[PDB]
């Protein structure tokens, strides 16, 4: 599913991401925009053999099992395919674990490079939240 910007903001808010570990909603919407262009079915292969999955491009090296990443850790306890669903619940629950790990949202390279320190409130502007 390809989310609309405000539709996604509303689903993220409902799943408890607004101000989760101090990151306002706009940060999460911005990260999703640049990670996956709001497409729950986005996959991207990394040079190390791991793959990133879903709306927040969560990586198979640490976070999910895809059966093809030798020595992967599966910290979210979830098949990576579950992260591609039109229901964002699995992605949200896993992202909460990731952002709690010590490095906050810096774990998402596009958030670091494209969202961090920008006016992220613009991403929720005009939305009925
Ligand atoms: Pt469809
Ligand atoms: Pt909804």
């Amino acid at each position: 599913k390809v989310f609309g910007r405000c539709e996604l903001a509303a689903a993220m808010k409902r799943h408890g991401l607004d101000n989760y570990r101090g990151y306002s909603l706009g940060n999460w919407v911005c990260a999703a925009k640049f990670e996956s262009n709001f497409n729950t079915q986005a996959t991207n292969r990394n040079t190390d053999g791991s793959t990133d999955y879903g709306i927040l491009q969560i990586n198979s090296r640490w976070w999910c099992n895809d059966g093809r990443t030798p020595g992967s850790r599966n910290l979210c306890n979830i098949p990576c395919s579950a992260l591609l669903s039109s229901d964002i619940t699995a992605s949200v629950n896993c992202a909460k674990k990731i952002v709690s790990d010590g490095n906050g949202m810096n774990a998402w390279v596009a958030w670091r490079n494209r969202c961090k320190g920008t006016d992220v409130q613009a991403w929720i502007r005009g939305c009925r939240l």
Side-chain angles (χ1 to χ4, degrees), residues 61-72:
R61 173 56 112 270
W62 303 106
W63 302 110
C64 61
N65 180 53
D66 64 7
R68 62 160 203 204
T69 311
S72 162

Side-chain angles (χ1 to χ4, degrees), residues 99-112:
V99 78
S100 296
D101 209 42
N103 304 312
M105 283 198 74
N106 295 293
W108 284 279
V109 57
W111 177 85
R112 259 208 297 118

Side-chain angles (χ1 to χ4, degrees), residues 6 10 22 28 31 35-37 39 43 51 54 56 59 74 83 85 90 114 123-125 127 129:
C6 296
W28 297 100
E35 289 288 354
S36 66
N37 204 27
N39 185 358
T43 59
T51 301
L56 287 169
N59 182 269
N74 200 10
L83 301 166
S85 177
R114 309 185 67 175
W123 292 99
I124 62 167
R125 182 158 175 87
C127 302
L129 300 174

Side-chain angles (χ1 to χ4, degrees), residues 46-90:
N46 307 123
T47 60
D48 72 358
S50 63
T51 301
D52 293 348
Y53 291 86
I55 200 95
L56 287 169
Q57 289 292 274
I58 285 168
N59 182 269
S60 69
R61 173 56 112 270
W62 303 106
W63 302 110
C64 61
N65 180 53
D66 64 7
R68 62 160 203 204
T69 311
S72 162
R73 294 235 60 218
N74 200 10
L75 259 1
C76 295
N77 211 37
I78 211 66
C80 296
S81 64
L83 301 166
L84 301 177
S85 177
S86 60
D87 181 339
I88 68 172
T89 305

